[PDB]
A paper describes a structure:
The bacterial RNA polymerase (RNAP) is a proven target for antibiotics. RbpA, essential in Mtb, is a component of transcription initiation complexes (TICs) that tightly binds the primary promoter specificity σA subunit of the RNAP holoenzyme (holo). The switch region sits at the base of the mobile RNAP clamp domain and, like a hinge, controls motions of the clamp crucial for DNA loading into the RNAP active-site cleft and maintaining the melted DNA in the channel. Here, we used single-particle cryo-electron microscopy (cryo-EM) to determine structures of Mtb transcription initiation complexes in three distinct conformational states, including a complex with Fdx at an overall resolution of 3.4 Å.
The first class comprised Mtb RbpA/σA-holo with one us-fork promoter fragment and bound to Fdx. The cryo-EM density map was computed to a nominal resolution of 3.4 Å. The us-fork promoter fragment was bound outside the RNAP active site cleft, as expected, with the −35 and −10 promoter elements engaged with the σA4 and σA2 domains, respectively. Local resolution calculations indicated that the central core of the structure, including the Fdx binding determinant and the bound Fdx, was determined to 2.9–3.4 Å resolution. The reconstruction from the Fdx-bound class reveals unambiguous density for Fdx and defines Fdx-interacting residues from four protein components of the complex, β, β', σA, and RbpA, including six water molecules, four of which mediate Fdx/RNAP interactions. Fdx binding to the TIC buries a large accessible surface area of 4,800 Å2 (β, 2,100 Å2; β', 2,000 Å2; σA, 300 Å2; RbpA, 330 Å2). Fdx forms direct hydrogen bonds with nine residues (βQ1054, βD1094, βT1096, βK1101, β'R84, β'K86, β'R89, β'E323, and β'R412) and water-mediated interactions with four (β'R89, β'D404, β'Q415, and RbpA-E17). Notably, the Fdx/RNAP interaction is stabilized by two cation-π interactions between β'R84 and the aromatic ring of the Fdx homodichloroorsellinic acid moiety and β'R89 and the conjugated double-bond system centered between C4 and C5 of the macrolide core. In the high-resolution Fdx/TIC structure, Fdx binds in a narrow gap between the open clamp module and the rest of the RNAP. Because this complex is not interacting with any other ligands that might be expected to alter the clamp conformation (such as Fdx or DNA), we will refer to this as the 'relaxed' clamp conformation. The two Fdx-bound complexes, with or without us-fork DNA, show further opening of the clamp (14° and 15°, respectively; orange and red in Figure 5B).
Numbering used by the authors:
A (entry chain B): 1 to 237
B (entry chain D): 443 to 1012, 1024 to 1030
C (entry chain D): 1227 to 1282
D (entry chain C): 450 to 1138
E (entry chain C): 30 to 56
F (entry chain E): 27 to 109
G (entry chain A): 1 to 226
Write the structure that this text describes.
């Protein structure tokens, strides 16, 4: 059996990291059969590093205030979460961010240890009014998907480190929709249209091929049941 | 458009266009090949159909939105696939209706089909100004469920400071969607997202930014649901945030606002996005109908027994000789009307606010409460063939199953209503015909007769402690008019000068000034010999701007009065009046 | 209706018609004088401007 | 139901426009004689009705009805046909009254129908008559709707009128849940070959059957196969017995068009859900599964009949022959040596069916044509090529060919030497645009047909067949179509009341031997005496598992469907069941029309069509009003001048189109230089200034 | 019921049918 | 401003067209006459040259003359004068 | 933590022509989609065989009846639309059927040439009497999905040959379900248990392997290819 055609992946470059790929022409109905799978894999199948839990000096019991900073304690958290970062030593690897005197703290104000790095130093994190120094201790680790705030196994037995929701996936948003190209010459085929916004940790083209890989190594499990089979074939590129 | 019908309509055009490309020796061979349906033609037909608008029409054609131009595109099968939003303007339903398709030939014809009669240029009705492409039955309950708020749902705004952080705030809609794909967050649960691409409401932005609180790249934490973020993703970028559960009236208001403040090419795209979201969420809405969801009032029998005692005492009084026939008949009618209303109120009290049979109505999607009251509860009183009520009355409800005599008595009104609907729909045509025959010479002639005479309107008659409450019917009397004489408050100075359109802002300013009489120019005093002038006629209702200098504004005003005639029910009450 | 007695008197008075309404034209098949039939509209002169025509 | 009809209009009676809305209204005497539900929807409501079930015609022409006379509150069995006159004078009881094993009205009082027509209430002493059973008011076509007492009169009328329009399918499967009027209305319809005298089968074949009566002489029945009906359907017929079966007088032997095992079966049972699916079933639209197309579950047959005649003309006699004027040789590869096509030829649109030719006469050809015949050495002929060609959009094999000839004693009309007819068959599948409908008046066209793999499938993997919309159920007051959806599932799964210690309160009454039913079991529910709102709910908590013990439909009657397209499950349980739907005869192949340029009437030059002629659409008046309201003068004039009458305009625009030039601007039509002449014929001097 | 070889269609009815349907085509 | 990319018949937008004309009827006749001119242009190219000019804008592969006329009007490449 | 291991697909056989396949572990929210994507291919893209057209001697077209048989021709056609045949070679090989005398012509009474085979010899095609003689030759072919009856005029066939619909689909019923443990301490996984049942033509293992091949050979075009 032969597909009697070949779908072509024709990329398209929107703003620096907002590519929009299209695949055509798929035989009906394969748009949905692989669109949702691509979406889910891109979303929750790529490794990546993110912050897990932090601790702010002077918040032990007072849980919404910080001396000398405009932002409260319930805003710094959702201000850090969106801090793109990459790591390679898979283990809790704490970092420290401190700064004194009146001024605006930024991503580049923190000194990452060996193995971890930051990809957006110009990010606004907080502003110290005057004559007040802030010190924070973060924990960075790897993973996949989106793990909500992992309530540690202390529920009080901890020094007061706030656990924050983690965003491991390098991509941030994915959508798709199919069409009906060439209903007479192609006899009602499909035209998949992806749209992937990617965090600036990796391009939106090196974060799809990896999904294709991790998916071809998962659908193979089945295909490695009777090698001498007969499916639909595409052929050479 | 079925490829067969397209190939029949466009036979000459394709016959020509397949001669340049030497697929046929001459026009005769081309005609023969087309009548044989050779494979070559299907490639040419797609090249000739491109950008060739066709006029679709449905009979009867009551108002000027019954014939609309469309950009066709070939389709397999034998059905004329119609868009779901133009089903209201046409009044067509898909239970076996049929539509006629015509083709324009000349260049002027195609220009008119592309400029005047196009589908996406007629959103607002020419009679009242409201929109006609607005969502309806399915898209309405879709958006209603996409934007409704549910207290206590999953992932709700927890904040329980004292032992941990809030645990209900998100970095941005992206993280919210990521956490909603998992089971963590519900789409209808109050949260606190941080938006950076939706303009905050006037109230917030006023203080948060003040100078210019634009929303291209500046964040503003807002506490809402996730559904409403996904909804406001649909509306334009500049349009402010809404944060209100989207009943049908709210959607009408929003679409009318977009139709006023924004161009015409944005409203159509917004409506398409809204229909898409509405269908997609109506499917996930979980709105089914099972006879285990048609609840019956818990204590109907007690009310029925009370009113039975009442009616039996009345009938015994009659039998005794106290009151004649008609007296007891009317007393029984009154008693049973009271019983019907009290059982309806009990039913409405019993139903939960999330019951499917009751949410399909609450969201203005379709139907009304009376129907539900006749499904569960009591049917009420059944009219006679002549028109008088029956003193029985029909007690059971269509969910308990009627008896034999009840059904036989109901058939009377059931058939009479059908006959009367036939007669009324047939007789509204004559009224429309005379209206059009009397007012065909009224067409805009000159830009301004430059007269001074003019009528006056109320505009929120003053009040004792209300100082000024809007007149109820102002949107149909003082909107889309042009002031004839400069309007001023107490001596003060000018508040609004002659020659304005009396829109929303000018109306608000005038009402603030506290004036309850504004002299407005009207076609009742136009000074042109034959026809009226654009300034006297006021603003057009379809375009939203001043009328043109060629509009046949007589036939429009005749059709607007004659079209809704089919809704006229009932000294005479209804259409005869 | 009663076209006979509507014609037998117009002819006497030697009366004339103005073709002013939009049902006389539809009766005699002439182009209706409303909308895109008005003279100001259906007598437009359309020719490229000299600047653009220079490029050709 | 075409018989048993009574039309107040026609000769010797009133008319349709000169009869006020008083003979239309239902009279309280119609109870038992004329059905109030069944009647047309057009401008005939009340003028054309249908007889009841139990009614009977007097010797004079007055309609009777049977009652049971009760004497001293003791309901007897003395049936007595009362007319309409002697019924009001008496007092009629109610059909469903608590009689206790003898004919005694258990309760002290009873409902009645007194003379005037009112619905009074009396003691159990004056009651002398009582109906024989409920559904007396209901006609035959209406007595087949399950749960009629739950539907509104409008929807019940539409359902009763949308059953005589169904089409006979190829399998003709019986309905899973109907009423008692199925089996007793097919054997009387006259399309079920009924064994005459009790005998024993001797020999059966698709063509005929033979029964060997117990007394010598046998009898052979001849079933009609693939006979065309009057409306184009198929009149097939097939035996339902073996070569040994014993039969008794009255038993059914051969099924009919819409029958199955000798009882009415107008449609098929389909698994239906009641959710709105992504906007494809919007405002009465319906979506189907490809299974209904692959497995020929709604395939129907249609047989059309074309006919041509060869007469004698002024120049001679028309001849039906294989020879033909200038024509190819690939348009004759299916005609027999003597013209008419051969049975079995797969014809299509435009092909030739009968080879006809008529004398041309005599003319004179211009140079360009004479210098062309000489080149191609084909001297002209004196015949016209007027054959019988298949109309537009029609195909399918050629079944039968009938031929009559005056020369062969085959009498025919005046001046007709030959007359041929050709029958063309066609198997039509279900296709978007074909109307469907249930028993309860709900209808709709088919808008989308999803592949079998993207359709809400139950937890087992079974895809729903049709997907009805919800917003149509409430506001139309036809919740009947929901109850049978619930029951339809029960009778499909099969139940067993758990009363192995004591019959539960809810089901301690209805029948015996109905507390359990094998899966896929048939049931019935008479019109006004059937299941009860409190019984289904009791029959819905026992829905024995399909293969592995797993109840799919919870107590409320709702499953948990998986979204076949997105993959994940829907967040709320959906209602699913088995509904009995029928394919109506309003297919798109009949409606779809078009016309680029056809024939025009001779007297009035407006377009005109017929059997094989397009016909042309009618641009009415209100359409002109709308056009004027738009201000589109050119489009209106074009629709009025160069598309209806202006002969010098139609050709002058067609030439422009075909040559690719500009369409000439519409001037003043030529239908204005004729008004001036028609005036001047009256001595009226009209001048254009 | 009252037909030699008719199928067995269980009924939900509760009452009797003293008189059986006439010869529908009798009219 | 910024709304979206129009598709087919809806391009170019009318809101950006009604500024080149007083009302919609004038624009209708404008486009009709420009399309008639363009179509005459295509015919007469065979024999001796003529004075008809256009299309001023480079057309597409197979594009109707009315759409070319509308694209030219939207670009401000030809003026008119009402009656 | 990025819990690191590999999903392992194991098979549990229930009957001859049906079986379950358990795949675990998977990332949360990934089980349903994977199961649906396998099912959506199993039901549409499995290659099989099916008779395309048949020809009978005594019948010219399809709307007639054969002398002696009980059912007319279109009934034999319908009964022949359930034949489960598994052609091996890729070409329109033909099969023959000839029966005389009274009896029943059951699908198991067809003489299949070398390469093809009938997998339900208990099917019932038609029934004959003493005067019945049934001879029919069928055309088996190859393909996937479902192709409607190929018009006779389209090909150059004689009047006798009769087209028939073809249903190439070895799979009969496919479903699935997940068991998302997702113990709420941030160490979660899924467990997809597909369930497949075929029409005795090909075992479930082969169906699933062909589905896996069709998905792998088409997800690769989005692989490092780009
Ligand atoms: Mg309708
Ligand atoms: Zn004026």
């Amino acid at each position: 059996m032969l597909i009697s055609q070949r779908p072509t992946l024709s990329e398209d470059v929107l703003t620096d990291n907002r590519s929009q790929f299209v695949i055509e022409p798929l035989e009906p109905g394969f748009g949905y059969t692989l669109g949702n799978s691509l979406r889910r894999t891109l979303l929750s199948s790529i490794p990546g590093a993110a912050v897990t839990s932090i601790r702010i000096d002077g918040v032990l019991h007072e849980f919404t205030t910080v001396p000398g900073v405009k932002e409260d304690v319930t805003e710094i958290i959702l201000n850090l979460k969106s801090l793109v970062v990459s790591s390679e030593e898979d283990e809790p690897v704490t970092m420290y961010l401190r700064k004194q005197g009146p001024g605006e703290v930024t991503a580049g104000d923190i000194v990452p240890p060996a193995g971890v790095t930051v990809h957006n130093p110009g990010m606004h994190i907080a502003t110290l009014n005057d004559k007040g120094k802030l010190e924070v201790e973060l924990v960075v680790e790897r993973g996949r998907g989106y793990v909500p705030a992992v309530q540690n196994r202390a529920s009080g037995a901890e020094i007061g480190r706030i656990p924050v929701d983690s965003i491991y996936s390098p991509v941030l948003k994915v959508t798709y929709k199919v069409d009906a190209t060439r209903v007479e010459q192609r006899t009602d085929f499909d035209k998949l249209i992806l749209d992937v916004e990617t965090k600036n940790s990796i391009s939106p083209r090196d974060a799809l091929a990896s999904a294709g890989k991790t998916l071809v190594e998962l659908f193979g499990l089945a295909r490695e049941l009777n090698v001498e089979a007969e499916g639909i074939e595409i052929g050479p590129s | 458009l079925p490829k067969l019908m397209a190939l029949e309509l466009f036979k000459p055009f394709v016959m020509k266009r397949l001669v340049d490309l030497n697929h046929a020796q001459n026009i005769k061979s081309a005609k023969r090949m087309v009548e044989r349906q050779r494979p070559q033609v299907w490639d040419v037909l797609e090249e000739v159909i491109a950008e060739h608008p066709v006029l679709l029409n449905r009979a009867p054609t009551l108002h000027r939105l019954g014939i609309q131009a469309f950009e066709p595109m070939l389709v397999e099968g034998k059905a004329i696939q119609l868009h779901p939003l133009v089903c209201e303007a046409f009044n067509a339903d898909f239970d076996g209706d049929q539509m006629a398709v015509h083709l324009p030939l000349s260049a002027e014809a195609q220009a008119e089909a592309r400029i005047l009669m196009l589908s996406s240029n007629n959103i607002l009705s020419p009679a009242s100004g409201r929109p006609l492409a607005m969502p309806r039955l399915d898209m309405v309950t879709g958006l209603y469920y996409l934007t409704t708020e549910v207290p206590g749902d999953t992932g709700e705004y927890q904040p329980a400071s004292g032992d941990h952080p809030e645990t209900g705030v998100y970095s941005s809609p992206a993280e919210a969607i990521m956490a909603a794909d998992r089971g963590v967050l519900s789409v209808r649960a109050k949260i606190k997202v941080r938006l950076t691409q939706l303009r905050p409401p006037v109230e917030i932005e006023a203080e948060l930014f003040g100078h210019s609180g634009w929303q291209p790249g500046d964040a503003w934490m807002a506490e809402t649901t996730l559904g409403r973020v996904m909804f406001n993703e649909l509306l334009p970028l500049g349009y402010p945030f809404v944060n209100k559960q989207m009943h049908k009236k709210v959607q009408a208001a929003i679409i009318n606002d977009l139709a006023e403040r924004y161009p015409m090419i944005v409203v159509a795209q917004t409506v398409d996005k809204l229909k898409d979201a509405g269908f997609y969420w109506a499917t996930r809405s979980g709105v089914t109908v099972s006879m285990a969801d048609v609840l019956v009032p818990p204590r109907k029998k007690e009310i029925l027994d009370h009113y039975e005692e009442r009616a039996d005492k009345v009938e015994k009084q009659f039998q005794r000789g106290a009151l004649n026939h008609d007296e007891r008949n009317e007393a029984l009618v009154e008693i049973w009307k009271e019983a019907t209303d009290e059982v309806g109120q009990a039913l409405r009290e019993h139903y939960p606010d999330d019951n499917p049979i009751i949410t399909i109505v609450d969201s203005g999607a379709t139907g009304n409460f009376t129907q539900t009251r006749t499904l569960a509860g009591m049917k009420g009183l059944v009219t006679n063939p002549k028109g008088e009520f029956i003193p029985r009355p029909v007690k059971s409800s269509f969910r308990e199953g009627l008896t034999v005599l009840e059904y036989f008595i109901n058939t009377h009104g059931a058939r009479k209503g059908l006959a009367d609907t036939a007669l009324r729909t047939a007789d509204s045509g004559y009224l429309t015909r005379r209206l059009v025959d009397v007012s065909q010479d009224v067409i805009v002639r000159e830009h301004d007769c430059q007269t001074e005479r003019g009528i006056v309107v109320e505009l929120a008659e003053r009040a004792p402690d209300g100082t000024l409450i809007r007149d109820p019917y102002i949107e149909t009397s003082a909107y889309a008019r042009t002031l004839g004489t400069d309007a001023v408050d107490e001596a003060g100075n000018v508040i609004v000068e002659r020659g304005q359109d009396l829109g929303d802002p000018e109306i608000d300013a005038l009402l603030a000034a506290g004036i309850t009489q504004v002299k407005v120019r009207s076609v009742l005093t136009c000074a042109t010999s034959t026809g009226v002038c654009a300034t006297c006629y006021g603003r057009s209702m379809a375009t939203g701007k001043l009328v043109d200098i060629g509009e046949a504004v007589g036939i429009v005003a005749a059709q607007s009065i004659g079209e809704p005639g089919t809704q006229l029910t009932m000294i005479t009450g209804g259409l005869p009046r | 209706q009663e076209t006979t007695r509507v014609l037998t008197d117009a002819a006497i008075n030697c009366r004339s018609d103005k073709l002013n309404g939009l049902k006389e034209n539809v009766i005699i098949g002439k182009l209706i004088p409303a909308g895109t039939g008005i003279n100001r509209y259906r007598n437009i002169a359309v020719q490229p401007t000299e600047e653009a025509r220079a490029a050709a | 139901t075409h018989k048993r009809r009574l039309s107040a209009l026609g000769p010797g009676g009133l008319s349709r426009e000169r009869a006020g809305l008083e003979v239309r209204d239902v009279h309280p005497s119609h109870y038992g004689r004329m059905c109030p539900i069944e009647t047309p929807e057009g401008p005939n409501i009340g003028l054309i009705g249908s007889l009841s079930v139990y009614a009977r015609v007097n010797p004079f022409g007055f309609i009777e009805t049977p009652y049971r006379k009760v004497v001293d509150g003791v309901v007897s069995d003395e049936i007595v046909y009362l007319t309409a006159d002697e019924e009001d004078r008496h007092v009629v009881a109610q059909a469903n009254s608590p009689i206790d094993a003898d004919g005694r009205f258990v309760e002290p009082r009873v409902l009645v129908r007194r003379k005037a027509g009112e619905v009074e209430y009396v003691p159990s002493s004056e009651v002398d008559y009582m109906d024989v059973s409920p559904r007396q008011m209901v006609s035959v076509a209406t007595a087949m709707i399950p749960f009629l007492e739950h539907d509104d009169a409008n929807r019940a009328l539409m359902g009763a009128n949308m059953q005589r329009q169904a089409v006979p399918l190829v399998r003709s499967e019986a309905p899973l849940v109907g009423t008692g009027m199925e089996l007793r209305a097919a054997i009387d319809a006259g399309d079920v070959v009924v064994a005459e005298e009790s005998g024993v089968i001797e020999e059966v074949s698709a063509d005929y059957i033979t029964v060997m009566h117990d007394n010598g002489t046998r009898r052979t029945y001849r079933m009609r196969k693939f006979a065309r009906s009057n409306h184009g359907t198929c009149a097939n017929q097939c035996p339902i017995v073996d070569a040994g079966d014993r039969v008794e007088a009255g038993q059914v032997i051969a099924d009919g068009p819409c029958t199955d095992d000798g009882e009415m079966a107008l449609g098929k049972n389909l698994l239906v859900a009641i959710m709105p699916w992504e906007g494809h079933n919007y405002e009465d639209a319906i979506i189907l599964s490809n299974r209904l197309v692959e497995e020929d579950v709604l395939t129907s047959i249609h047989i059309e009949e074309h006919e041509i005649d060869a007469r004698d003309t002024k120049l001679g006699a028309e001849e039906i022959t294989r020879d033909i004027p200038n024509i190819s040789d690939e348009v004759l590869a299916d005609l027999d040596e003597r013209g008419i096509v051969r049975i079995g030829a797969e014809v299509r649109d435009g092909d030739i069916l009968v080879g006809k030719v008529t004398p041309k006469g005599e003319t004179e050809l211009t140079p360009e044509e004479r210098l062309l015949r000489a080149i191609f050495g084909e001297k002209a002929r004196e015949v016209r090529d007027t054959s019988l060609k298949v109309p537009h959009g029609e195909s399918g094999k050629v079944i039968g060919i009938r031929v009559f000839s005056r020369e062969d004693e085959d009498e025919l009309p005046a001046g007709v030497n030959e007359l041929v007819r050709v029958y063309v068959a066609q198997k039509r599948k279900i296709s978007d645009g074909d109307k469907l409908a249930g028993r309860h008046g709900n209808k709709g066209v088919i808008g989308k047909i999803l592949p079998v793999e993207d359709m809400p499938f139950l937890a087992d993997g079974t895809p729903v067949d049709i997907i009805l919309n919800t917003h149509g159920v409430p506001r139309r007051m036809n919740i009947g179509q929901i109850l049978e959806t619930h029951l339809g599932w029960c009778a499909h799964s099969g139940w067993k009341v758990d009363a192995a210690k004591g019959v539960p309160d809810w089901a301690a009454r209805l029948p015996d031997e109905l507390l359990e039913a094998q899966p896929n079991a048939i049931v019935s529910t008479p019109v006004f005496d059937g299941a009860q709102e409190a019984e289904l709910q009791g029959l819905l908590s026992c829905t024995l598992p399909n293969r592995d013990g797993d109840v799919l439909v919870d107590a409320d009657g709702k499953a948990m469907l998986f979204d076949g397209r997105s993959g994940e499950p829907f967040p709320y349980p959906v209602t699913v069941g088995y509904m009995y739907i029928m394919k109506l005869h309003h297919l798109v192949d009949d409606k779809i029309h078009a016309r680029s340029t056809g024939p025009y009437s001779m007297i009035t030059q407006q377009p005109l069509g017929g059997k094989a002629q397009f016909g042309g659409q009618r641009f009415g008046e209100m359409e002109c009003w709308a056009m004027q309201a738009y201000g589109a003068a050119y489009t209106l004039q074009e629709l009025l001048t160069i598309k209806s009458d202006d002969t010098v305009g139609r050709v002058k625009v067609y030439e422009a189109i075909v040559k690719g030039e500009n369409i000439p601007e519409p001037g003043i039509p030529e239908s204005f230089k004729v008004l001036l002449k028609e005036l001047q014929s009256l001595c009226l001097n009209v001048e254009v200034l | 019921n009252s037909v030699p070889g008719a199928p067995n269609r269980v009924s939900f009815a509760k009452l009797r049918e003293p008189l059986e349907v006439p010869g529908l085509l009798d009219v | 401003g910024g709304y979206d990319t129009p598709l087919g018949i809806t391009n170019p937008p009318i809101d950006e067209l009604l500024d080149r004309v007083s009302s919609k009827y004038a624009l209708v006749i404008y486009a009709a006459k420009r399309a008639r001119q363009i179509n005459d242009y295509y015919n007469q190219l065979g024999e001796g040259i003529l004075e008809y000019v256009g299309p001023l804008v480079e057309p597409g592969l197979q594009e109707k003359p009315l759409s070319i006329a509308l694209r030219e009007i939207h670009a401000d490449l030809l003026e008119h004068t009402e009656g």
